[PDB]
């Protein structure tokens, strides 16, 4: 595992993010945890690829070009903004907007979002 | 597991942060990953308990009341600022000062830090 990677435990539901890398394989509920690699799922990019907008003092992230659903059974669980050595995470729940604002001083950033159904997605400016 | 809990594999060094809880037990290198509970390690609070300072637009976090070492074999790996729905993580490296600045609009915050040797610590404003 490498820092910032997101792993999911099939069946049991746990989802973790790596803070410190290592060689060991993460296991849960009798199987290796699944690496949720960004932009690998066969789903509409229009609703899943994060859109980054530069604002005063930071960035505004929307998921996505077309607003993604935020329903009890299908929503964006969180949005993250990655920069230099920073990982800012904004958790979301059904009924909220698929959007997040991050105040940071970084010219180059990477935005990520995780959909409970369609996986992990990212975009950069 | 519960959201934002930190777990570590005492064998290979993998350390992860829970994004979604689930019901499965996290395993690595043939043993349950260890829940790194905050303020449980028998270490000096003066250098480990985060100190939070409110600034314009956010908070400055220092580890701790007395500056903690930042050497190759003993340093603060990261400082985080938690809200009711946000987790901002600032990774650090040896040589740096044990501090971080977070621009955020939240009245109540929890600051956490992880020392590679002395573990997980937290404090609230
Ligand atoms: Ca984070
Ligand atoms: Fe391990
Ligand atoms: Fe989706
Ligand atoms: Fe599991
Ligand atoms: Fe220490």
UniProtKB/Swiss-Prot annotation, chains A, B:
Reactions catalysed according to its record: reduced [rubredoxin] + superoxide + 2 H(+) = oxidized [rubredoxin] + H2O2
GO molecular function: iron ion binding; superoxide reductase activity
Positions annotated to bind Fe cation 1: 9, 12, 28-29
Keyword line: Detoxification, Electron transport, Iron, Metal-binding, Oxidoreductase, Transport
Gene behind this protein: dfx
Entry note about domains: Is organized in two protein domains. The N-terminal domain has a fold similar to that of desulforedoxin and contains a mononuclear Fe(3+) ion, center I. The second domain contains a different mononuclear iron center, center II, with a Fe(2+) ion.
Alphabetical list of CDD domains matching this protein: DSRD, SORL_Dfx_classI
A GO BP entry: removal of superoxide radicals
SUPFAM superfamilies referenced in this protein's UniProt entry, alphabetically: Rubredoxin-like, Superoxide reductase-like
Function summary: Catalyzes the one-electron reduction of superoxide anion radical to hydrogen peroxide at a nonheme ferrous iron center. Plays a fundamental role in case of oxidative stress via its superoxide detoxification activity.
Keyword Repeat: no
Name of this protein: Desulfoferrodoxin
Complex and partners: Homodimer.
Cofactor note: Binds 1 Fe(3+) ion per subunit. The iron ion 1 is coordinated via 4 cysteine residues. Binds 1 Fe(2+) ion per subunit. The iron ion 2 is coordinated via four histidines and one cysteine residue.
Organism this protein belongs to: Desulfarculus baarsii (strain ATCC 33931 / DSM 2075 / LMG 7858 / VKM B-1802 / 2st14)
Homology family: Belongs to the desulfoferrodoxin family.
């Amino acid at each position: 595992p490498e820092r910032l990677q997101v792993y999911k435990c099939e069946v049991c539901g746990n989802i973790v993010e790596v803070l410190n890398g290592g060689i060991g394989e993460l296991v849960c509920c009798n199987q290796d945890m699944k690496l949720m690699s960004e932009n690998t799922v066969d789903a509409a990019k229009a609703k899943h690829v994060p859109v980054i907008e530069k604002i005063d003092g930071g960035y505004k992230v929307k998921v996505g070009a077309v607003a993604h659903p935020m329903e009890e059974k299908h929503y964006i669980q969180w949005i993250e903004l990655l920069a230099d050595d920073k990982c800012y995470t904004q958790f979301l729940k059904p009924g909220q907007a698929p959007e997040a604002v991050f105040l940071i001083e970084a010219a180059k950033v990477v935005a990520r979002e995780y959909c409970n159904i369609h996986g992990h997605w990212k975009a950069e400016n």
